[PDB]
Design an enzyme around this catalytic site. Structure first.
Site, PDB file in Angstrom:
ATOM      1  N   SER A  39      10.649  22.630  26.488  1.00 32.51           N
ATOM      2  CA  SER A  39      10.224  21.225  26.633  1.00 32.51           C
ATOM      3  C   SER A  39       9.073  21.108  27.647  1.00 32.51           C
ATOM      4  O   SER A  39       9.236  21.464  28.824  1.00 32.51           O
ATOM      5  CB  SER A  39      11.401  20.310  27.043  1.00 32.51           C
ATOM      6  N   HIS A  75       7.388  19.134  21.964  1.00 30.14           N
ATOM      7  CA  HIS A  75       7.502  20.335  21.122  1.00 30.14           C
ATOM      8  C   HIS A  75       6.561  20.169  19.906  1.00 30.14           C
ATOM      9  O   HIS A  75       6.825  19.345  19.031  1.00 30.14           O
ATOM     10  CB  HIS A  75       8.953  20.514  20.613  1.00 30.14           C
ATOM     11  N   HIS A 123      16.869  22.483  18.207  1.00 35.17           N
ATOM     12  CA  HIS A 123      18.059  22.249  18.980  1.00 35.17           C
ATOM     13  C   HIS A 123      19.189  21.804  18.083  1.00 35.17           C
ATOM     14  O   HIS A 123      19.012  20.998  17.169  1.00 35.17           O
ATOM     15  CB  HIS A 123      17.822  21.168  20.033  1.00 35.17           C
ATOM     16  N   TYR A 151      21.382  19.620  18.849  1.00 33.73           N
ATOM     17  CA  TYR A 151      21.514  18.143  18.879  1.00 33.73           C
ATOM     18  C   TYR A 151      20.670  17.375  17.848  1.00 33.73           C
ATOM     19  O   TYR A 151      20.994  16.225  17.508  1.00 33.73           O
ATOM     20  CB  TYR A 151      21.225  17.556  20.260  1.00 33.73           C
ATOM     21  N   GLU A 152      19.577  17.981  17.383  1.00 33.43           N
ATOM     22  CA  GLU A 152      18.745  17.376  16.330  1.00 33.43           C
ATOM     23  C   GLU A 152      19.505  17.412  14.990  1.00 33.43           C
ATOM     24  O   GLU A 152      19.118  16.756  14.054  1.00 33.43           O
ATOM     25  CB  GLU A 152      17.398  18.098  16.164  1.00 33.43           C
ATOM     26  N   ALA A 180      13.098  23.987  29.850  1.00 34.37           N
ATOM     27  CA  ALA A 180      13.396  23.061  30.946  1.00 34.37           C
ATOM     28  C   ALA A 180      14.916  23.073  31.191  1.00 34.37           C
ATOM     29  O   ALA A 180      15.699  23.311  30.284  1.00 34.37           O
ATOM     30  CB  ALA A 180      12.887  21.665  30.624  1.00 34.37           C
ATOM     31  N   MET A 186      20.043  22.504  26.948  1.00 37.48           N
ATOM     32  CA  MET A 186      20.578  22.323  25.598  1.00 37.48           C
ATOM     33  C   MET A 186      20.007  23.282  24.560  1.00 37.48           C
ATOM     34  O   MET A 186      19.979  22.952  23.366  1.00 37.48           O
ATOM     35  CB  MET A 186      20.349  20.873  25.136  1.00 37.48           C
ATOM     36  N   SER A 187      19.596  24.465  24.993  1.00 41.31           N
ATOM     37  CA  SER A 187      18.945  25.453  24.104  1.00 41.31           C
ATOM     38  C   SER A 187      19.163  26.898  24.585  1.00 41.31           C
ATOM     39  O   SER A 187      20.067  27.182  25.400  1.00 41.31           O
ATOM     40  CB  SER A 187      17.429  25.148  24.052  1.00 41.31           C
ATOM     41  N   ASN A 199      14.656  18.612  37.087  1.00 38.65           N
ATOM     42  CA  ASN A 199      15.387  17.562  37.781  1.00 38.65           C
ATOM     43  C   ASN A 199      16.631  18.144  38.451  1.00 38.65           C
ATOM     44  O   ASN A 199      17.078  19.220  38.086  1.00 38.65           O
ATOM     45  CB  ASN A 199      15.777  16.452  36.799  1.00 38.65           C
ATOM     46  N   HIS A 251      14.119  11.599  30.077  1.00 38.66           N
ATOM     47  CA  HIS A 251      13.215  12.565  29.490  1.00 38.66           C
ATOM     48  C   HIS A 251      11.793  12.497  30.082  1.00 38.66           C
ATOM     49  O   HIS A 251      11.127  13.524  30.206  1.00 38.66           O
ATOM     50  CB  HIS A 251      13.196  12.416  27.969  1.00 38.66           C
TER      51      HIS A 251
HETATM   52  N1  LIG Z   1      21.756  19.138  29.646  1.00 40.56           N
HETATM   53  C1  LIG Z   1      20.610  18.997  30.341  1.00 40.56           C
HETATM   54  N2  LIG Z   1      19.466  19.500  29.819  1.00 40.56           N
HETATM   55  C2  LIG Z   1      18.331  19.339  30.528  1.00 40.56           C
HETATM   56  C3  LIG Z   1      16.968  19.754  30.252  1.00 40.56           C
HETATM   57  C4  LIG Z   1      16.483  20.533  29.095  1.00 40.56           C
HETATM   58  N3  LIG Z   1      16.097  19.825  27.869  1.00 40.56           N
HETATM   59  C5  LIG Z   1      15.060  18.809  28.062  1.00 40.56           C
HETATM   60  C6  LIG Z   1      15.297  17.865  26.904  1.00 40.56           C
HETATM   61  C7  LIG Z   1      15.595  16.500  27.484  1.00 40.56           C
HETATM   62  O1  LIG Z   1      14.561  16.135  28.406  1.00 40.56           O
HETATM   63  C8  LIG Z   1      16.458  18.441  26.106  1.00 40.56           C
HETATM   64  O2  LIG Z   1      16.016  19.333  25.065  1.00 40.56           O
HETATM   65  C9  LIG Z   1      17.215  19.224  27.132  1.00 40.56           C
HETATM   66  C10 LIG Z   1      16.223  19.341  31.340  1.00 40.56           C
HETATM   67  N4  LIG Z   1      17.009  18.695  32.231  1.00 40.56           N
HETATM   68  C11 LIG Z   1      18.270  18.656  31.797  1.00 40.56           C
HETATM   69  C12 LIG Z   1      19.556  18.135  32.267  1.00 40.56           C
HETATM   70  O3  LIG Z   1      19.647  17.533  33.353  1.00 40.56           O
HETATM   71  N5  LIG Z   1      20.642  18.352  31.521  1.00 40.56           N
END
Ligand SMILES: Nc1nc2c(CN3C[C@H](CO)[C@@H](O)C3)c[nH]c2c(=O)[nH]1
Ligand SMILES: Nc1nc2c(CN3C[C@H](CO)[C@@H](O)C3)c[nH]c2c(=O)[nH]1
Ligand SMILES: Nc1nc2c(CN3C[C@H](CO)[C@@H](O)C3)c[nH]c2c(=O)[nH]1
EC number: 2.4.2.1
Lengths: 287, 288, 288
Positions: free
Chosen positions: A34, A65, A87, A89-90, A117, A220-221, A244, A258
């Site tokens: 990301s 992406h 991902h 989740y998609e 990320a 999430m990946s 973050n 995001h």
């Molecule tokens: N679960 C989670 N994933 C992420 C991500 C990674 N991805 C970044 C994108 C949402 O910004 C998703 O594909 C997950 C960055 N920060 C975080 C977080 O605090 N939590």
């Protein structure tokens, strides 16, 4: 059977199509996460394919992406770079998410570099930091969501592959020593990445669970790509950009979102490009 | 759009009636044999063997060291049915296929299920070759939705919400622990909690540490679904794991979990396991 | 093969229009009543009842103690809609069906969701009959992929990646506790973390210990998906659990979790529940 929708022959056709349509012969595949798509800007002699050109490829759905496979040289090394990934989740099954990894194996790739990320769970981490992935915790894998579920094809690998050595020791040692060559205030961090499915971000209580389990970052990946890469014999190296700090108390009024994640990628683009370009030299040569 | 059992009541009953037609055996106890443990059928007397592929509605074992045969006979004079090879969700099977035979055994008249498996040792006091009595389990796939009881409940088998806090029979565990003296082995009989993960990949070091923090003594990829279906339909349940490997818990080690080592520790513990199970048959109650 | 919500935006819209035409009630607050808590509808005035079976696209309740009715009315002078019975993933429903009414309520003009449930007590200082305010949750199925938001996101409801750190409204929580103090109550109000597990089977002792170690105070098989969908589309959320039983946490007990005890708790708590719902309804802000 909850099995792979792709046959060996599907992976082979995609590989032969790519081998026909480019002269490049990558040794290294890099999956860009990301807001890390600027890693493809430094590639010399770039040739670009959109994912929608390539037979059997899945579409990319998430902002930051691009949906582009790019072949080229990165600081001398023959590379292929996924500009954007898939991902769970998609809505993709994990045998679609990881489809490219096996295609790369069939092109002749021997090394997979995975980037993402991630949210920081270790309090000593700071936004902007780079964490080498020493290890993972595959929470979905515990429950049945493993890309190797279904019949095993011997042509890729073993029925029961080990993951206790997934993240290459030698490449990690070299990237710690090499870190001197960026003269950064902050040290190179190292730790455990945990995959959760998403797409909603963690509660405070969930954040504390993940900390107690021993994870240092969350995302999430990545984990499914690593399993499929280790299944077919690829050397694997990985890192996360801490975008973050995950919220871990009920008092804070801050919230994961995001935009903040995308913004931490724009800031870090310079530092990552330089990091990855140096890393390329530390990769062993083939044979 | 409903996620349910793909077998009807009628499929279980048809399979059970086919079995009763083709054998004179009427088993009281069912024993499910795990990885490298297929030699548990060697001491059955008056054995009759069916291949899984002959039996209507039965799934196929695809994993090495699972023969794929249902064996009826007598173990220390007890009427048994033994699954020589089992099914796993890592093979692609939903848990409702994986547990198909447990309900067939209920309809055949079986009242006690013995589950065996190979397992990775998480508790550092376990040695390779130890037998662990399963006191309890942790069903990680179950937390997330993967439970063989998902979907409409059939009252011909059991309750909508069965309890599991008493899953592993407390009396047979007392009897098996006290009976262990009858074998005069160097190691005592180990006891502990089994945790299921789906696999088929083995654990990372960080995952091993997770499972240890949760309180698991051994890890595997089977058994739990069978035990849940068995308890749902009223079966008495007893279990044990053969510790085939210590799971890797530090980054320095050269050792790696692998199937060949698992299968070999299986065959090494052959005699010993047959003997333990034989003596165990004497502690299972009759009906009435 | 893409794992997506089977409803279109226009399915939700049709259900919402059908309800708008069939009732003159215009609720501000939706309340989801869980196992044995259907009695919370008794105090509604100007009640108008719809069976789930007559409402387009609504799933059905299949669990005893879930009447399967949608009741519109005034609860303490505030305009409400109540689900008298909810749906669970253990019945075989995908989470996009389980949570279907939440988005219908959004399109009806509801701005606050109250979620209630029965729960098993994990924290040893809880007693049977306690009401626990839900400060937070642990979504165990969510970690593995079972999230009602999986698949393409519809921007008409909300964002691709919604935050959940602030899911349970802090201000309502503060007010409920001030109020309970101001009443000078003997038995103080419990507050804690709810963990969802899929079910339908109850926990083993080892599983209970895992959920204690993870920081959970109460366990159930619902609620969390509804909260995630509520927050995704901008609803204010408040949850509470009735502690109906203490989860079995040692091998020496002969007690077992069972559904009958869960219903006995709800009827017993009726006066307490009414009093609490009143406090709670008077804590909900009015729209502007
Ligand atoms: N679960 C989670 N994933 C992420 C991500 C990674 N991805 C970044 C994108 C949402 O910004 C998703 O594909 C997950 C960055 N920060 C975080 C977080 O605090 N939590
Ligand atoms: N998860 C896990 N399972 C096992 C098993 C049990 N089964 C043995 C077989 C792999 O050899 C699979 O069916 C899992 C033995 N050792 C281990 C281990 O270290 N880990
Ligand atoms: N998981 C779990 N859920 C509950 C519930 C909540 N629901 C009550 C009903 C079974 O009684 C299911 O919908 C779960 C009450 N007690 C318990 C418990 O001890 N455990």
């Amino acid at each position: 059977l909850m099995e792979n929708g792709y046959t060996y022959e599907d992976y082979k056709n995609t590989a032969e199509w790519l081998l026909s349509h480019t002269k490049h012969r990558p040794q290294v595949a890099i999956i860009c996460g990301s807001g890390l798509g600027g890693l493809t800007d430094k590639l010399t002699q770039a040739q670009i394919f959109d994912y929608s050109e390539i037979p059997n490829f899945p579409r990319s759905t998430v902002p930051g992406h691009a949906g582009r496979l790019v072949f080229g040289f990165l600081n001398g090394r023959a590379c292929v770079m996924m500009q954007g990934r898939f991902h769970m989740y998609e809505g993709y099954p994990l045998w679609k998410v990881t489809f490219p990894v096996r295609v790369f194996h069939l092109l002749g790739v021997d090394t997979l570099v995975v980037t993402n990320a991630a949210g920081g769970l270790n309090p000593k981490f700071e936004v902007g930091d780079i964490m080498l992935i020493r290890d993972h915790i595959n929470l979905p894998g515990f429950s049945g969501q493993n890309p190797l579920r279904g019949p095993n094809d011997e042509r890729f690998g073993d029925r029961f592959p080990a993951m206790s050595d997934a993240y290459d020791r030698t490449m990690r040692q070299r990237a710690l020593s090499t870190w001197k060559q960026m003269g950064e205030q902050r040290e190179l961090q190292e730790g455990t990445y945990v995959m959760v499915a998403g797409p909603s971000f963690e509660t405070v209580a969930e954040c504390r669970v993940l900390q107690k389990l021993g994870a240092d970052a969350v995302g999430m990946s990545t984990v499914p790509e690593v399993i499929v890469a280790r299944h077919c014999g690829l050397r694997v190296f990985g890192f996360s950009l801490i975008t973050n700090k995950v919220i871990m108390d009920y008092e804070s009024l801050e919230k994961a979102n995001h935009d903040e994640v995308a913004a931490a990628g724009k800031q870090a683009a310079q530092k990552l490009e330089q990091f990855v370009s140096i890393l390329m030299a530390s990769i062993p040569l083939p044979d």
